Symmetry: C2
Subunit: 134 residues, 2 copies
């Protein structure tokens, strides 16, 4: 596909809408949107393997790792008002092929992803299946 | 993918969980599950174009159809207690390729689909994005 969207919903104040767009088949995917209701600071932002909402965020499974994982988008950053303004360009994920995240689940975490440099990401606050958008 | 699921939800009492499984990459897709809260009788059952939940079932767009539409899955049948136990096999939709319904929306309608043989489907009661399942 060319465009997609994930509506992030959970049991709490955290919610948001994240859009995805990829023009070239093997080109980067632009990810942008906003999430609010967050504790100030960094929050793990990943694509988890299953777009299964039968138990909400709980049935999403582990990170998408077709074989950091392909689903690891890093962190989003919430300001003191609890809002994270998202704008990313990623060339590992795709909206088509073996790396397609279409039909999988976008998750924002309670904690930061230390990305392997914690010098020594918690629960899934809000999640959404990634669907093909207009 | 080889398996998928959609959780149907809407404004009213109609709820359901529908599973999909496709053994061979180009083979038929088996659809099964249950839906409750429906009026006895036939109810249009289709895959709509977009897996966009930003505006309920309204943002799902039209019937999925790459060239009955590809997206039409016929009707489901609610029994006298409003339960539609679903069991369908379809060789036109797929879980990969140009006819993939992954990332799109499954919708159960208020009225029957006449399938072009009405002798001369209404509102969207519930819907859910179709996601990859384990
Ligand atoms: Cu995660
Ligand atoms: Cu329809």
């Amino acid at each position: 596909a060319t465009k997609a969207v994930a509506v992030l919903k959970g049991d709490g104040p955290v919610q948001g809408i994240i859009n995805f767009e990829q023009k070239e088949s093997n080109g980067p995917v632009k990810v942008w949107g906003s999430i609010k209701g967050l504790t100030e600071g960094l929050h793990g932002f990943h694509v988890h393997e299953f777009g299964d909402n039968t138990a909400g965020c709980t049935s999403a499974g582990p990170h998408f790792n077709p074989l950091r994982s392909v689903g690891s988008l890093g962190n989003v950053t919430a300001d003191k008002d609890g809002v994270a303004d998202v704008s990313i360009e990623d060339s590992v994920i795709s909206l088509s092929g073996d790396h397609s995240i279409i039909g999988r689940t976008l998750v924002v975490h309670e904690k930061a992803d230390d990305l392997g440099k914690g010098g020594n990401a918690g629960s899934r606050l809000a999640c959404g299946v990634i669907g093909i958008a207009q």
